[PDB]
Design a protein around this ligand. Structure first.
Ligand SMILES: Nc1nc2c(ncn2[C@@H]2O[C@H](COP(=O)(O)OP(=O)(O)O)[C@@H](O)[C@H]2O)c(=O)[nH]1
Ligand SMILES: [Mg+2]
Length: 165
């Protein structure tokens, strides 16, 4: 039973918790304490392959945190489409991941969340441009409506598979 270790990173309030819960528990969480960091596991079938997702929802001493940075195989870098600052913060996250992994080639997906909202300040092109700049996928999601939620997580799994060959 093959296991994939994922880490969800990004600025506070982007929807890291909501996304993880939406994937795992299949519901939208209205309020989840921002200070809580925890791991969640689920057995899933991705592209005909049954596997175990092991995801850390970051809030940012914890040995669990340390282990996931060390052993985690792929990172969701999350911003919100209505939060310019959060998009601006993305590069910070990437540099942290690069350092921890000691590698330019770490499996990652840029996720633009809250795309159910009209109040959009980060346009598709901007995020695609950044994604292409890093050579990673960009995926637009809504935790509230489930739009692209499995896609974001499954894409990252596919990024990991590439790295493993
Ligand atoms: N409209 C909308 N609200 C969202 C979405 N994702 C999260 N939220 C809300 O944004 C707030 C912060 O989300 P949370 O998951 O706690 O973000 P975190 O701090 O990054 O873990 C909460 O009020 C969530 O219900 C989404 O896709 N659409
Ligand atoms: Mg949270």
């Amino acid at each position: 039973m093959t296991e994939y270790k994922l880490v969800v990173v990004g600025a506070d309030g982007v929807g890291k918790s909501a996304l993880t819960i939406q994937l795992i528990q299949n519901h939208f969480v209205d309020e989840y304490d921002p200070t809580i960091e925890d791991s969640y596991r689920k057995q899933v079938v991705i592209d005909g392959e049954t596997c175990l997702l092991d995801i850390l929802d970051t809030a940012r001493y914890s040995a669990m945190r340390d282990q996931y940075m060390r052993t985690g195989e792929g990172f969701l870098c999350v911003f919100a489409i209505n939060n310019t600052k959060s998009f601006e913060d993305i590069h910070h996250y990437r540099e942290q991941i690069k350092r921890v992994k000691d590698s330019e080639d770490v499996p990652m997906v840029l996720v633009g969340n809250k795309c159910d909202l009209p109040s959009r300040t980060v346009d598709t092109k901007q995020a695609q441009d950044l994604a292409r700049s890093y050579g990673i996928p960009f995926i637009e999601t809504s935790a509230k409506t489930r739009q692209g939620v499995d896609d974001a997580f499954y894409t990252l799994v596919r990024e990991i598979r590439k790295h493993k060959e």
